[PDB]
Amino acid sequence: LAVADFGPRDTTSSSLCGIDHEALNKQIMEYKRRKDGRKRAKPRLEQDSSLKS
Amino acid sequence: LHIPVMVDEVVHCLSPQKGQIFLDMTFGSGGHTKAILQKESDIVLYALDRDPTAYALAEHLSELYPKQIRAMLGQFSQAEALLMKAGVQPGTFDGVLMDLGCSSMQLDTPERGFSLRKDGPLDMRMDGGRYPDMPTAADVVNALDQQALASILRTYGEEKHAKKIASAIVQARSIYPITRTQQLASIVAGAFPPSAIYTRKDLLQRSTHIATKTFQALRIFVNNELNELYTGLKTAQKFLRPGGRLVALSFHSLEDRIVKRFLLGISMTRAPLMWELIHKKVLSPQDQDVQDNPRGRSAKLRAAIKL
RNA sequence: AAACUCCAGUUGACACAAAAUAGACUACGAAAGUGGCUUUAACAUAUCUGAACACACAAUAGCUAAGACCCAAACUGGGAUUAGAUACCCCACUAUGCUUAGCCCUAAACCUCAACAGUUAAAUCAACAAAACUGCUCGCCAGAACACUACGAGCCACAGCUUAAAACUCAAAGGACCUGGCGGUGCUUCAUAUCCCUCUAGAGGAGCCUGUUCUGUAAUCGAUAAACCCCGAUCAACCUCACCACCUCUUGCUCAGCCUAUAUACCGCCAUCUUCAGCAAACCCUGAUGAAGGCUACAAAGUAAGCGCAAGUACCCACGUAAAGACGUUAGGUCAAGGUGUAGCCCAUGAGGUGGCAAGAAAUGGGCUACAUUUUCUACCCCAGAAAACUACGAUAGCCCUUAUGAAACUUAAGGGUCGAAGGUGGAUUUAGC
């Protein structure tokens, strides 16, 4: 820093709002232009037929 | 009757005195504007409102004081141009009283559409036909998709169940047009079970309609109050005299956020700050006064002096 | 930020507060507790057990009365924070913490281990904790929740404590451990076009091309977070076609037919991790033969076929790029490639004919061409001359005409004429490349 040479020494508020109020305002205006659960069985209780076969 | 909210504080805060010119960006009923023309008989005042009905009141009330009050009509963004036509670009306004929200007359008259309790056309527009093409709340709900419609309620209205109250509106509009306030209230209230109609309570622990905040959301997007509030404050600063006392009244913390950070130069989402908060405190009206005027319970007054 | 500025620093004087180091010690006492110094008094029992209530005690907090008040500090006030913050963070100050004299009698009052006596051989032992038990005695317990509750009773307690149910309700509640998932979970090492920065050219702004969404329409369908979006289509003017409207046929091109439902019945063919390296039959062994686990190279219980990687092959090498890439994950995609289980239609959900739809108020993805001077036009294919801001750069768009293809072209493509627009190198963000 000491060696270094410093030389001779002397856009929408909608985004801030959080919603694009302008684009939506046009969208509604464009519309205005046209205007004018189930049960799950326990796995352990699932029934098997291997013994019956 | 609606007493001007915090009129005693706003008068003391601005200390209207002879030889000082003041502006009022929200004349509305004019209760605050008249309370300021009473303390100082030699005061000079300028008025503005978005409602032509409110601008007519000022014109009719201009008879009481011919030149001490000057009536103007237009939005906050259009205020600079309107006042620039007068030629007061520097302005040197000693104080700008930017009252916010909906006028008592606007929401007391059912025809204006602001009251869910009564039955009026679903206008919810502060504009009184000055721009007959300005979309009304009925148009906003019938046009926007669920994703878009949800955003308005979620942010402006603080709606936690944005998806739920938005889907109901989309289904209702298809069956029939949504054109009346009570129809919207029933549509919003149907989203939840019958018990939920009045389960929600106000900040005072007082039951309110479940759609109370939903109406506020549509009110803010139809009238773009939030974006217009940023320009209105900026315009006031340009037209505000150095050493001049600004006084805002944020009915809700939502709009207070813009006022809260603007005065403190904080990013809405470094150079030195240029404001002096003589009355930093953001407090509701006296509890005795809250019961008398519950509408103004949430009024947060942020005063500052330009630097 | 508020707060103080009768403030801060040095030196001296200075308490009814609290007791570094020792203490890495493990002592004392019935427990509660006890850790600056000194002195006085003083730590029951020559069997053992023996109480919610008898007797005497009992941290902290709290109550009553009188004092002390350095510091800390509920509450409270103020300053921030926040969608809200009657919290966490900062400042001030009180009850209170202290002394005295009375009460109150509660603790996760917990080594979560009742006293006393004895044993280390059996079986070591559900698990974890803290190795496993025996004798003897007192206290206590008997599914969860209701319930540190109700009533009764006693109590200096009066929003209190001790003792302590029932009704209704349920098929569990619970203890210990294991796996998986998750952690605003720790540590170490990593990612090589790779997570961040670094390098190059882009996207995000403009017009156009094209997909999708939405809206529209009498008028398909499917894909649709990574892993959809110039995707099924290496391709829709008719046809294609599965859509809509109208008309027509009934053993029907078929020993019929169905692009009807179900991709959550499937085969087939694939995406994805995979820009992975693991999967795994059959055995063996450990845990008391529990759910589970199985590595140490100066090796300590693993051996392992097969599959994958690898090798090999293709392309110009042994390099690189392809190709390959198991098991499994997302009931991922596709019944509309074809086939097909199940269910459905059979004068119709089948077949044929004629005409017609497929637009853009908008939004968005991808691409093309640009914004120009490393450029534009011409010759040339690199030693040139002109152009160069409202006649410049810039449309592959709009409009008009001709041509090509076709039976059919305002429509599709090519060319010409006319026209000369936005665009002046693009915010947050984001893509690709060794």
Ligand SMILES: Nc1ncnc2c1ncn2[C@@H]1O[C@H](CSCC[C@H](N)C(=O)O)[C@@H](O)[C@H]1O
């Ligand atoms: N962007 C804007 N520009 C101008 N006026 C606005 C505005 N947004 C709201 N307003 C108006 O400002 C007023 C605020 S509420 C009424 C307050 C008024 N001081 C009274 O007399 O009560 C309403 O009249 C409302 O219509």
Ligand SMILES: [K+]
């Ligand atoms: K000490």
Ligand SMILES: [K+]
């Ligand atoms: K303990």
Ligand SMILES: [K+]
């Ligand atoms: K785990």
Ligand SMILES: [K+]
């Ligand atoms: K770009």
Ligand SMILES: [K+]
């Ligand atoms: K499949």
Ligand SMILES: [K+]
């Ligand atoms: K099929």
Ligand SMILES: [K+]
């Ligand atoms: K089928």
Ligand SMILES: [K+]
């Ligand atoms: K693009």
Ligand SMILES: [Mg+2]
């Ligand atoms: Mg004894």
Ligand SMILES: [Mg+2]
């Ligand atoms: Mg006892």
Ligand SMILES: [Mg+2]
């Ligand atoms: Mg007893």
Ligand SMILES: [Mg+2]
């Ligand atoms: Mg007891």
Ligand SMILES: [Mg+2]
């Ligand atoms: Mg005690």
Ligand SMILES: [Mg+2]
């Ligand atoms: Mg005490």
Ligand SMILES: [Mg+2]
């Ligand atoms: Mg203190």
